[PDB]
Amino acid sequence: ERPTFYRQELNKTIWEVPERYQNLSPVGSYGSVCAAFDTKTGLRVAVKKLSRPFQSIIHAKRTYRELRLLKHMKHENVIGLLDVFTPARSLEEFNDVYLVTHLMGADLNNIVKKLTDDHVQFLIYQILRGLKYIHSADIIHRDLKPSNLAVNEDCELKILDFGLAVATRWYRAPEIMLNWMHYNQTVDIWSVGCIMAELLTGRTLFPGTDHIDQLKLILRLVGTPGAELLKKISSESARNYIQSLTQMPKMNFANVFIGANPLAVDLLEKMLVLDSDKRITAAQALAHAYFAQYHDPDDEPVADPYDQSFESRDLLIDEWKSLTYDEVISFVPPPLD
Ligand SMILES: Nc1ccc2c(NC3CC3)nc(-c3ccccc3)nc2c1
Numbered sequence: 001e002r003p004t005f006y007r008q009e010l011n012k013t014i015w016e017v018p019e020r021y022q023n024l025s026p027v028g029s030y031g032s033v034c035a036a037f038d039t040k041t042g043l044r045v046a047v048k049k050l051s052r053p054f055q056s057i058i059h060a061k062r063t064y065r066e067l068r069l070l071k072h073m074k075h076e077n078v079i080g081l082l083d084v085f086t087p088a089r090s091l092e093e094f095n096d097v098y099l100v101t102h103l104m105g106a107d108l109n110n111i112v113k114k115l116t117d118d119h120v121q122f123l124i125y126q127i128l129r130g131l132k133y134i135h136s137a138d139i140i141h142r143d144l145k146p147s148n149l150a151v152n153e154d155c156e157l158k159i160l161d162f163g164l165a166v167a168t169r170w171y172r173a174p175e176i177m178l179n180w181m182h183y184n185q186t187v188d189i190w191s192v193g194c195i196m197a198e199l200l201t202g203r204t205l206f207p208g209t210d211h212i213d214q215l216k217l218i219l220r221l222v223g224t225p226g227a228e229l230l231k232k233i234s235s236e237s238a239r240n241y242i243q244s245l246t247q248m249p250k251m252n253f254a255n256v257f258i259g260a261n262p263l264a265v266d267l268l269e270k271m272l273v274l275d276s277d278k279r280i281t282a283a284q285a286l287a288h289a290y291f292a293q294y295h296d297p298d299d300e301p302v303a304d305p306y307d308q309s310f311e312s313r314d315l316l317i318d319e320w321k322s323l324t325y326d327e328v329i330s331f332v333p334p335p336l337d
């Protein structure tokens with residue numbers, strides 16, 4: 001049977017949540033989030049209410065994608081669904097989607113207020129372990145950045161799908177910047193590299209003002225593409241653009257990252273590689289020496305397979321609406337431990 005819902009008004013917007021969640025308290029805005037108390041488990045949680053989940057076909061797909069992705073994530077360094085619920089009693093009236101997950105307080109972006117090498121080691125290690133699991137499901141995150149990294153006071157880290165209301169572009173792989181349709185998983189590794197760099201130094205590696213500037217700054221550090229990468233660019237335009245640029249030499253990373261752990265610097269070298277067929281993977285980075293005190297092959301799991309064939313379907317608004325509803329209805333709480 002269904003539980004007792006109860007109603008209140010909040011950030012101008014309205015919230016009809018179950019009895020079980022108490023003391024809602026907005027933390028800021030795709031949707032807005034409340035910190036609340038979960039009387040069933042005793043823990044503080046975040047309740048995200050989706051804004052306009054079914055406003056267009058693209059919203060309806062996005063809303064479904066997000067539910068599928070969250071329902072699939074079962075791993076310590078990746079955000080999982082505690083609960084999904086709606087005020088609606090039937091498909092016909094189904095209109096609002098709420099998502100519940102563990103509260104974690106802060107995000108890397110705002111905890112950056114320069115860490116020690118043990119900390120960045122533990123922080124990046126946990127990201128990589130998260131990416132292992134995500135990547136093993138054929139899922140790419142694409143927008144890895146500080147605000148999408150949630151960290152409790154235990155220094156425990158979880159990859160968020162979407163974070164609090166700092167540019168996207170600063171952490172994007174150059175091939176995504178050049179609009180390559182065919183990028184692999186290691187666009188996320190690039191992001192990690194940029195984040196690690198920011199923790200070790202306290203400075204955004206590539207603070208570009210736009211997508212041209214952004215690429216400028218990247219090539220300064222990592223050099224213009226050699227001929228081996230040059231020949232993989234299937235686009236006259238791009239090829240013209242960078243082959244027209246001034247030939248920058250690949251800087252020495254131990255000169256730029258002075259007095260960082262030379263193991264840290266090694267890893268950064270292996271992550272900020274221009275050519276994405278050569279970038280270290282999440283799985284291979286975990287075995288890097290830099291994480292020797294954390295690395296445990298027996299405790300770095302992979303995900304169950306994830307069906308994303310839905311990504312290719314062109315479906316009616318009411319069809320995505322109803323697939324979501326099925327996902328809400330078929331939801332199994334994780335065990336309470
Ligand atoms: N195996 C790869 C590795 C890296 C690549 C990359 N990124 C490099 C910084 C230039 N860019 C491109 C590409 C292709 C078409 C249009 C624009 C860019 N392809 C790449 C293929």
Ligand SMILES: O=C(c1ccccc1)N1CCCCC1
Pocket residue numbers: 033046047048079099100101102103104105150160162163164
């Ligand atoms: O955006 C969310 C969220 C909330 C509920 C379900 C999924 C993600 N969070 C943001 C950072 C604090 C933890 C949760």
